[PDB]
Scaffold this active site. Structure first.
Site, short mmCIF file in Angstrom:
data_model
loop_
_atom_site.label_atom_id
_atom_site.label_comp_id
_atom_site.label_asym_id
_atom_site.label_seq_id
_atom_site.Cartn_x
_atom_site.Cartn_y
_atom_site.Cartn_z
N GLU A 294 46.65 41.16 43.64
CA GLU A 294 47.50 40.71 44.74
C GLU A 294 48.24 39.43 44.38
OE1 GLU A 294 45.12 42.55 48.63
OE2 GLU A 294 44.85 40.44 48.08
N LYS B 84 39.32 37.63 51.23
CA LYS B 84 40.77 37.45 51.19
C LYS B 84 41.21 36.55 52.35
CE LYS B 84 41.56 41.72 48.70
NZ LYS B 84 41.97 43.16 48.65
N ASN C 146 34.98 39.56 48.62
CA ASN C 146 36.31 38.96 48.61
C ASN C 146 36.98 39.05 49.99
OD1 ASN C 146 38.87 38.12 48.22
ND2 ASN C 146 39.45 39.71 46.74
N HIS D 266 43.74 38.17 40.33
CA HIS D 266 43.53 39.28 41.24
C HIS D 266 44.92 39.92 41.41
CE1 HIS D 266 43.11 41.51 44.95
NE2 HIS D 266 41.81 41.27 45.00
N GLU E 178 40.61 46.90 38.33
CA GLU E 178 41.21 47.27 39.59
C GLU E 178 42.12 48.48 39.39
OE1 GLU E 178 43.00 43.18 40.36
OE2 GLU E 178 41.78 43.42 42.18
N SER F 84 38.14 50.50 45.79
CA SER F 84 37.59 50.45 47.14
C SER F 84 36.11 50.79 47.15
CB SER F 84 38.35 51.39 48.07
OG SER F 84 39.46 50.72 48.63
N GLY G 152 46.23 52.20 47.18
CA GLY G 152 47.48 52.44 47.87
C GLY G 152 47.76 53.92 47.92
#
Lengths: 246, 246
Positions: free
Chosen positions: B95, B10, B8, B93, B163, B209, B169
């Site tokens: 985001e 992005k 991905n 996703h 996810e 990650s 974060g």
């Protein structure tokens, strides 16, 4: 002032279709040094359209990100648009203001990213049906414009577009003169927040429904410098509209 | 079942960086029939990437419009993707759930739209720090999953992705053993409303990650079938990650 004729294919098209429409557009022989013609295809339809349309035609994308590169899945940045040589970007189109909640704040952030990467922005706006019925036109168009008009460094790299939403589906339709009023009003707004000069050099397009029958009656208007055509631009007769600006 | 591994990118990449990378990607000899390896570049990079990357590599987009074709400036409709032969698309996703207010409703809609057009999806979901922190991951996951899962008819063309937003974060990092749990629960929900067969054949990638050093630790888990790799997929090392799955 160089007339501006843009084609907003919105979300439409197929490989074969563009092949036809583009081949059609190519037949019209115009001087780009006198007139600007821009067709904005679908993100993934860009490379196809660009390699089909002769250079005299200019191309952009219907949108840009409000962020730079990085973790923003599904977004194209002015940074990328630049390395890919995309020359124009539409920002604040009402359809994205509506269905996607984009805002003046967002349009500002987007306008800024574009100019920093040397993109040319075609920024849109326009009061609603309810807003106009409240005799709040001039008011809304000022709040709108004053939301980003301060970011423009070179008044030939940013193109204003007025979208008479108060007509977007109501049988209604702005007369070539009614539009003209808002236009001259937008420009004034420009004059008093940038300088007599600036306003007399920034192009301001019409956003209402445009077509073969009214195009020339519109471009002819004192402060209408061309237009961002919608559905009329998916038909080969679009060349007729371009002509009205030649 | 068949391991699935996707990159991905992005909003990252220039025409050259992609030329170079893709090439560093081609070198790796893997059977596209034993493993699935999919790459998702920025919209205006699909064509460029697709051509530079070989057939063993499936390619797709990072978002698909919830509307079909029509007046929707800025969007890419599933049909346009089908005419373009874009094989994969990412949906929901995190985001896009965050920065843009994508909903469970939207996801449901885009998936139904993608499948109508024979597209293959990689749907995402997961809870927040606040939600896990208040013991609700299983309550959330189920909602997010029951939201669209039923649309699936060929459990090979829709790939679920977890996810761990609660980590993403928070300077934290879900452990392989932890990720595994959530994965077995998602699977179960697939079973409870689709049947053991459907359930035991659908893949559920990791989505947290992933890097050259922990990919093993996860893929190894029996309810992990690959992952939605982020930044690491912009490096040439990504291959070693594909390797962990072959």
């Amino acid at each position: 002032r160089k007339y501006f004729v843009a084609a907003n294919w919105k979300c439409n098209g197929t490989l074969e279709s563009i092949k036809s429409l583009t081949n059609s557009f190519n037949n019209l022989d115009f001087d780009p040094s006198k007139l600007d013609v821009v067709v904005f295809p679908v993100s993934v339809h860009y490379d196809h359209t660009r390699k089909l349309l002769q250079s005299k035609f200019s191309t952009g994308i219907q949108n840009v990100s409000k962020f730079g590169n990085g973790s923003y899945t599904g977004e194209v940045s002015a940074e990328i648009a630049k390395d890919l040589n995309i020359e124009y970007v539409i920002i604040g189109h009402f359809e994205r203001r509506k269905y996607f909640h984009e805002t003046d704040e967002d349009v500002r952030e987007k306008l800024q990213a574009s100019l920093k990467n040397n993109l040319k922005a075609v920024v849109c706006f326009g009061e609603s049906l309810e807003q106009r019925e409240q005799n709040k036109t001039i008011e809304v168009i000022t709040k709108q414009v004053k939301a980003f008009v301060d970011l423009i460094d070179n008044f030939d790299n940013v193109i204003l577009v007025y979208e008479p939403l108060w007509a977007i589906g109501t049988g209604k339709t702005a007369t070539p003169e009614q539009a003209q009023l808002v236009h001259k009003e937008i420009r004034k707004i420009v004059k008093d927040t940038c300088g007599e000069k600036q306003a007399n050099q920034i192009r301001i397009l019409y956003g209402g429904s445009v077509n073969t029958e009214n195009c020339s009656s519109l471009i002819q208007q004192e402060d209408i410098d061309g237009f961002l055509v919608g559905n009329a631009s998916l038909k080969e007769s679009f060349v007729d509209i371009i002509k009205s600006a030649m």
